[PDB]
């Protein structure tokens, strides 16, 4: 009378849990494949916000790895008169990012967009047909991902050396 | 190599959304009906751990409401000697209770059981075939303590 009884909940419920376990199977093997590419050197890996960003901007990323714990936004700012601009990543916490003055012409800067980092990197991934994988902060692999590698890694299609 | 590109996920994950959509309307069905009973009869609903357990024990609960945000443990200490026994409830946090000695014979009391409140009340509800609903809504967890019941009849309990 107030909750399912025909047992479709239990059915739909069933598949759902199995799929999750498939997820973590994919998330594990993926971190591991990043590791296996890293060890074998190759120069076919990359990790950290700055290093992984530049590869995405040249479509070199085969597989993109992001921790389920990434708490950080990318802030773009632009000068209201001259062509000055800058971007940078700030860890989000409870107001909003500010815009001071132009170090070029002294005019007031203004923030033109804020985007969580996981957004920007998925937009670029999608762009270059990179595969997008997420990694919960549970299994050690997915833990180290955030601990060491800034919670952003990647297996590359080729060695940019970058 | 790392995901479900069969479309299977998309469907089930989505079907799991449609059915969660529904389960929630139902939980509003149940809380609304409890409050309506409370309004034509203050004796045909129950609320609170005390009145509700008393009513389930006597199989007079038509429908039972349990707040998902309920952290509590029912302790049972018996005397290792005389037939003494008590039952108290303890709000949940990160330990396990101890008994001490007996007010009757002075022997050692032992905690013979700890059972999740939701568990006991559930078993209690399975023997009378009462319909069990978990509510998260928060007017339950707060205004009444996350335990409430729509009786099948007025019990004076
Ligand atoms: Zn300027
Ligand atoms: Zn005793």
UniProtKB/Swiss-Prot annotation, chain B:
It is found in: Cytoplasm. It comes from the Archaea. Belongs to the eukaryotic release factor 1 family. Heterodimer of two subunits, one of which binds GTP. Directs the termination of nascent peptide synthesis (translation) in response to the termination codons UAA, UAG and UGA. This is Peptide chain release factor subunit 1. It comes from Methanosarcina mazei (strain ATCC BAA-159 / DSM 3647 / Goe1 / Go1 / JCM 11833 / OCM 88).
């Amino acid at each position: 009378a107030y909750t399912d009884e025909s047992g479709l909940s239990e059915l739909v419920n069933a598949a759902g849990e199995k799929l999750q376990d498939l997820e973590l199977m994919g998330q594990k093997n993926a971190v591991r494949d990043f590791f296996k590419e890293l060890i074998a050197d190759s120069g076919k890996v990359a990790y950290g916000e700055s290093q992984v960003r530049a590869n995405l901007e040249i479509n070199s990323v085969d597989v993109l790895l992001l921790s389920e714990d990434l708490r950080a936004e990318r802030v773009t700012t632009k000068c209201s008169v001259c062509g000055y601009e800058n971007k940078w990543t700030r860890r989000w916490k409870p107001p909003a990012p500010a815009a001071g003055n132009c170090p070029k012409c002294g005019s007031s800067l203004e923030v033109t967009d804020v985007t969580d980092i996981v957004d920007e990197f998925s937009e670029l991934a999608d762009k270059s047909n990179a595969k997008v994988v997420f990694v919960s902060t549970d299994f050690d692999e997915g833990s180290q991902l955030m601990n060491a590698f800034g919670g952003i890694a990647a297996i590359l299609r080729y060695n940019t050396g970058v």
